Swiss-Prot record:
Residue positions, PTM N-acetylmethionine: 1
Keywords assigned by UniProt, alphabetized: Acetylation, Cell membrane, Cytoplasm, Disease variant, Glycoprotein, Golgi apparatus, GTP-binding, Hydrolase, Isopeptide bond, Lipoprotein, Membrane, Methylation, Nucleotide-binding, Nucleus, Palmitate, Prenylation, Proto-oncogene, S-nitrosylation, Ubl conjugation
The organism of origin for this protein: Homo sapiens
Gene for this chain: HRAS
Pfam families in alphabetical order: Ras
Activation/inhibition comment: Alternates between an inactive form bound to GDP and an active form bound to GTP. Activated by a guanine nucleotide-exchange factor (GEF) and inactivated by a GTPase-activating protein (GAP).
Post-translational modification: Palmitoylated by the ZDHHC9-GOLGA7 complex. A continuous cycle of de- and re-palmitoylation regulates rapid exchange between plasma membrane and Golgi. S-nitrosylated; critical for redox regulation. Important for stimulating guanine nucleotide exchange. No structural perturbation on nitrosylation.
Protein name: GTPase HRas
GO BP terms in the entry: adipose tissue development; animal organ morphogenesis; cell surface receptor signaling pathway; cellular response to gamma radiation; cellular senescence; chemotaxis; defense response to protozoan; endocytosis
Length: 166
């Protein structure tokens, strides 16, 4: 079994916890809406390889977290999440990417740009705009809904594949 340390980042309210919980849930607990940053585990077979995913659901930059720097040092890949109905969350992506680059001292960190809440009609960030940004970073872009589950597994598995291909 190969272990991957994945970190989910992005602005307050974009759906970092909803995404993490949707991936990792065993559904014994009906509703789980975490209020605090935390770490979760999921075992999954990705392309024949049994993987243990350790997933850190971080708070947005506007919340204080003592361990944030060490989180980024430990993290092997990062899901950079914004919400497709929240332009500010999209503009904020630059800040998360600069923080990771500053801490890890690298331009080549495995990452996936995630445009969450794609179930919503009230879109303010066009897919093409986010594809352009992802292209500028040299990373994949994947739209998700934590409500419908669309794209959720693909986002996390794409990140694993980026780590593996690094
Ligand atoms: N329509 C829709 N709502 C979503 C989606 N993902 C999350 N939400 C909703 O958006 C809100 C924020 O979700 P949450 O998972 O707490 O986001 P967060 O990024 O972890 N927030 P925080 O930074 O404060 O921990 C909740 O009301 C949640 O139900 C999605 O894909 N679609
Ligand atoms: Mg959260």
């Amino acid at each position: 079994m190969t272990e991957y340390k994945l970190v989910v980042v992005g602005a307050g309210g974009v759906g970092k916890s909803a995404l993490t919980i949707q991936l990792i849930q065993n559904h014994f607990v009906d509703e789980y809406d975490p209020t605090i940053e935390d770490s979760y585990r999921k075992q999954v077979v990705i392309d024949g390889e049994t993987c243990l995913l350790d997933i850190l659901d971080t708070a947005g930059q506007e919340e204080y977290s003592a361990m944030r720097d060490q989180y980024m040092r430990t993290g092997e890949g990062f899901l950079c999440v914004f919400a497709i109905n929240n332009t500010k969350s999209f503009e904020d992506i630059h800040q998360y990417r600069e923080q990771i680059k500053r801490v890890k001292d690298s331009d080549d960190v495995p990452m996936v740009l995630v445009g969450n809440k794609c179930d919503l009609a009230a879109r303010t960030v066009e897919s093409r705009q986010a594809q352009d940004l992802a292209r500028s970073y040299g990373i994949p872009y994947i739209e998700t809904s934590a409500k419908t589950r669309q794209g959720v597994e693909d986002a996390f598995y794409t990140l694993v594949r980026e780590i593996r291909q690094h």
